[PDB]
Amino acid sequence: WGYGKHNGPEHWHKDFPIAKGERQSPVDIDTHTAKYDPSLKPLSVSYDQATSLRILNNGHAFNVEFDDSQDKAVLKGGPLDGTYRLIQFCFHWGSLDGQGSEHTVDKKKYAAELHLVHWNTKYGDFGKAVQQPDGLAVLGIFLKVGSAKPGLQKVVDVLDSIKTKGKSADFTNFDPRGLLPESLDYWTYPGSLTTPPLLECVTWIVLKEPISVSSEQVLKFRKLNFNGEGEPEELMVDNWRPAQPLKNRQIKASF
Ligand SMILES: [Zn+2]
Numbered sequence: 198w199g200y201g202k203h204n205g206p207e208h209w210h211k212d213f214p215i216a217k218g219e220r221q222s223p224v225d226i227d228t229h230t231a232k233y234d235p236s237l238k239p240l241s242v243s244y245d246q247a248t249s250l251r252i253l254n255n256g257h258a259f260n261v262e263f264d265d266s267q268d269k270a271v272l273k274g275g276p277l278d279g280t281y282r283l284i285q286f287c288f289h290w291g292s293l294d295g296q297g298s299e300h301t302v303d304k305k306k307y308a309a310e311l312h313l314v315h316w317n318t319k320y321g322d323f324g325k326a327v328q329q330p331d332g333l334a335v336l337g338i339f340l341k342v343g344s345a346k347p348g349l350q351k352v353v354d355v356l357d358s359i360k361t362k363g364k365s366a367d368f369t370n371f372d373p374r375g376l377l378p379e380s381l382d383y384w385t386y387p388g389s390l391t392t393p394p395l396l397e398c399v400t401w402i403v404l405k406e407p408i409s410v411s412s413e414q415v416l417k418f419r420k421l422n423f424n425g426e427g428e429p430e431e432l433m434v435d436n437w438r439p440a441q442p443l444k445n446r447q448i449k450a451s452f
Pocket residue numbers: 287288289311312391
């Protein structure tokens with residue numbers, strides 16, 4: 198699977214038939230159709246004690262891993278039940294500033310999209326959480342091109358060391374609080390992972406308010422390679438999935 202002409206999104210269903218399931222992600226957020234639900238609680242992010250371990254190039258994106266052995270970095274509140282622990286964050290970007298995000302707002306595409314993945318501690322581990330409907334909670338954050346994001350520089354600076362597929366680097370004392378928008382107003386809906394095995398275990402929480410990153414920041418993203426070291430160079434760009442059918446599901450807004 199990949200994002201090329203022969204292994205792209207349109208071909209995933211052959212290996213992962215759930216690709217055409219009933220609660221696939223990402224989706225287009227039609228803001229006029231979204232239902233304002235007064236019964237939603239504010240999001241509750243506790244990241245002061247988060248512990249990053251390292252960053253890696255898995256050949257389809259770059260992930261920053263976190264130590265989820267204890268409730269150090271957790272999400273609760275909102276449309277959620279119980280505690281969800283931060284395990285990793287993944288990014289998705291395009292070849293141009295005009296595309297990159299997975300989720301779209303009234304068909305508008307942002308330059309990139311950041312996903313903060315959390316699992317339900319009721320299930321004991323991440324492997325068990327993905328076999329459940331309320332197993333995961335992903336906080337989606339859009340990135341628009343404008344001013345630099347001070348908080349993101351530490352990640353940009355380390356990308357050189359994880360250029361190719363399989364490379365990994367020690368990445369400690371990285372505080373994710375640096376990537377949060379000012380407002381925590383959100384959209385919520387039941388969906389799935391955006392990449393295979395595309396399991397329908399996710400409660401999506403998409404922030405209304407996007408973060409701005411400089412052009413030279415996102416430019417460094419586009420220097421990553423899909424390929425392994427010693428192979429033909431294939432740039433990691435356009436690692437995003439096209440919006441999937443809503444199909445009955447409803448998008449609720451906390452605002
Ligand atoms: Zn992602």
